[PDB]
Amino acid sequence: PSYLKDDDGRSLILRGFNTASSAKSAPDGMPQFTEADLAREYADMGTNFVRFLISWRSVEPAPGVYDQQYLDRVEDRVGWYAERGYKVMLDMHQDVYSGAITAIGNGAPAWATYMDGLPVEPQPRWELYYIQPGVMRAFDNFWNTTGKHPELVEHYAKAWRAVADRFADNDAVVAYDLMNEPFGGSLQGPAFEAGPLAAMYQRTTDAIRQVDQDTWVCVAPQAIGVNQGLPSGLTKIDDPRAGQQRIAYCPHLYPLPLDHEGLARTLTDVTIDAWRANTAHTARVLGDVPIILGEFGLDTTLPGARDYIERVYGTAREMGAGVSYWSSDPGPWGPYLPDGTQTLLVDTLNKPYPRAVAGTPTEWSSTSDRLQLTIEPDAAITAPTEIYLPEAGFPGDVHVEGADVVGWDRQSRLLTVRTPADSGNVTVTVTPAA
Ligand SMILES: CN(C)c1ccc(C(=O)NC[C@H]2N[C@H](CO)[C@@H](O)[C@@H]2O)cc1
Ligand code: NA
Incomplete structure (x- = not known):
C-alpha cells in the first residue's frame, strides 16, 4: 500500500470522522460542532483526521463570486483541528445535487441548478429523489x-x-x-466515470494546481453500485505538480444488507471482500495511489454492529487506508447520542494506532493494552514515529521493545519513538509499564 505523507516524510495512518451532516443545510454552511466537541472526540478516541464538509453553494453564492467570509469560517474550524494535531480533508459535499431541487438535497447553489421545469415529486425515502426527472436533469x-x-x-x-x-x-x-458521491444522472457506470466524471476531475485538479502544488487531490468513483461492491470504471487522473503524483482514491463502503447476522452477515462479509478487490484495482489504475475510506457507517444499536465495524477497520488497516467514519453527528450512527451519551463507537474506535510512521508500515496490530508495528525504514526521515495510546490500557508509563522512546506525552496521549534505518525492517512492540 501507498500512504499520504506529512512534511517530515512520515507515512500517515488516518482515523476520524465526517464532520458533519449538520453543515449540509446550515445557513452559514458550518456544522453544529464546537471546539469543545472536538476536545471530547480527541479525549475519547484520539482521532487524527477529519473529512470536513464544505459546499459549493457556500463557496460560490453567485457565478464567479467567492465568499471569503465563508472561507474565514472554514479556516477557523480547520484551526481547531490544527491545534489538536489533526489532518484535514476538505469534502466538496453534495447529496441529490442541491437544496434547490424542491431541505432534501444539498451542495450546488440555486443558480447552478437547472431542472428545466421537470418534476421532483415527494418520495417516501430521500434516496429516491436522485432518479426524479428534475434531479436527473439538474445532473x-x-x-x-x-x-x-x-x-x-x-x-x-x-x-x-x-x-x-x-x-x-x-x-x-x-x-x-x-x-462527494458522484452521480451521473442519465449516464451510469464506465460511460459516466471514464467520461464527464474523469474530465471534471482533471479540470478541477488542473485548476487547484494553479495555486496549490502539494495538497493531495482525492477522487471518488460514482457512489451508486460501487458503494455496494461493484467495480468502478474511473480512469487515471494526471497531476501536473512537479515531482511525484499526489492523487488519492476516496471510495465509500455501504453494503446492501445494512441499508449483521445470518445470511445478511454473509452478504456483508462478501461485500467487503468485493469492495477491497475493486478498490485495490482502481487505486492501481490511478497510479498505485493511497486509499482513504471516506465514508462507512451504520446504526450502532443493530446487533452485529461491532463485528462489522471491527472487520471494516481491520480491512482498512490491511489495505493501508485512512478512514473517516460517517459521521460525528449526534445519533445512534455516531459516537454520541444527542444528550452526549457514548454509543458503542467510542470503545470500539478507542484503540492504539500509529498516527505518523518514520517509514512504511508493513504490518501492525493493536488491542486495548498492546500495539505492534513493523516498519520498512527510510534513512531520510528524522522525525520520530508518532503513536496514539489510550489511557484505559496505558494508565502510566510505557514499555517499548524494538525502539527508543523519544517522548511519552500522557496528556496528549502521543508516544514518540526512534528506530534504526540501517538494520532492515524493524518491529516495535508497546505494552504498559509493570
Ligand atoms: C440513488 N443514489 C444515486 C444513491 C442512493 C443512496 C446513496 C447512499 O445511501 N449513500 C450513503 C451515504 N452517503 C451520504 C453522505 O455522502 C449519506 O447521507 C448517505 O447515508 C447514494 C446514492
Ligand atoms: Na497543507
Whole structure:
C-alpha cells in the first residue's frame, strides 16, 4: 500500500470522522460542532483526521463570486483541528445535487441548478429523489450531457481553485476530496466515470494546481453500485505538480444488507471482500495511489454492529487506508447520542494506532493494552514515529521493545519513538509499564 505523507516524510495512518451532516443545510454552511466537541472526540478516541464538509453553494453564492467570509469560517474550524494535531480533508459535499431541487438535497447553489421545469415529486425515502426527472436533469445539465451548460464544470473547478488558494499554506490541510458521491444522472457506470466524471476531475485538479502544488487531490468513483461492491470504471487522473503524483482514491463502503447476522452477515462479509478487490484495482489504475475510506457507517444499536465495524477497520488497516467514519453527528450512527451519551463507537474506535510512521508500515496490530508495528525504514526521515495510546490500557508509563522512546506525552496521549534505518525492517512492540 501507498500512504499520504506529512512534511517530515512520515507515512500517515488516518482515523476520524465526517464532520458533519449538520453543515449540509446550515445557513452559514458550518456544522453544529464546537471546539469543545472536538476536545471530547480527541479525549475519547484520539482521532487524527477529519473529512470536513464544505459546499459549493457556500463557496460560490453567485457565478464567479467567492465568499471569503465563508472561507474565514472554514479556516477557523480547520484551526481547531490544527491545534489538536489533526489532518484535514476538505469534502466538496453534495447529496441529490442541491437544496434547490424542491431541505432534501444539498451542495450546488440555486443558480447552478437547472431542472428545466421537470418534476421532483415527494418520495417516501430521500434516496429516491436522485432518479426524479428534475434531479436527473439538474445532473445532466451539470455534466453538460444536455449540451446546454458547459460553464458549470468550469465554475466548479474554479470554486475549488478559490478554496485551494485559501488553504494552500495551511499546515493542517492534507487533502481535497473533489466530489462527494458522484452521480451521473442519465449516464451510469464506465460511460459516466471514464467520461464527464474523469474530465471534471482533471479540470478541477488542473485548476487547484494553479495555486496549490502539494495538497493531495482525492477522487471518488460514482457512489451508486460501487458503494455496494461493484467495480468502478474511473480512469487515471494526471497531476501536473512537479515531482511525484499526489492523487488519492476516496471510495465509500455501504453494503446492501445494512441499508449483521445470518445470511445478511454473509452478504456483508462478501461485500467487503468485493469492495477491497475493486478498490485495490482502481487505486492501481490511478497510479498505485493511497486509499482513504471516506465514508462507512451504520446504526450502532443493530446487533452485529461491532463485528462489522471491527472487520471494516481491520480491512482498512490491511489495505493501508485512512478512514473517516460517517459521521460525528449526534445519533445512534455516531459516537454520541444527542444528550452526549457514548454509543458503542467510542470503545470500539478507542484503540492504539500509529498516527505518523518514520517509514512504511508493513504490518501492525493493536488491542486495548498492546500495539505492534513493523516498519520498512527510510534513512531520510528524522522525525520520530508518532503513536496514539489510550489511557484505559496505558494508565502510566510505557514499555517499548524494538525502539527508543523519544517522548511519552500522557496528556496528549502521543508516544514518540526512534528506530534504526540501517538494520532492515524493524518491529516495535508497546505494552504498559509493570
Ligand atoms: C440513488 N443514489 C444515486 C444513491 C442512493 C443512496 C446513496 C447512499 O445511501 N449513500 C450513503 C451515504 N452517503 C451520504 C453522505 O455522502 C449519506 O447521507 C448517505 O447515508 C447514494 C446514492
Ligand atoms: Na497543507
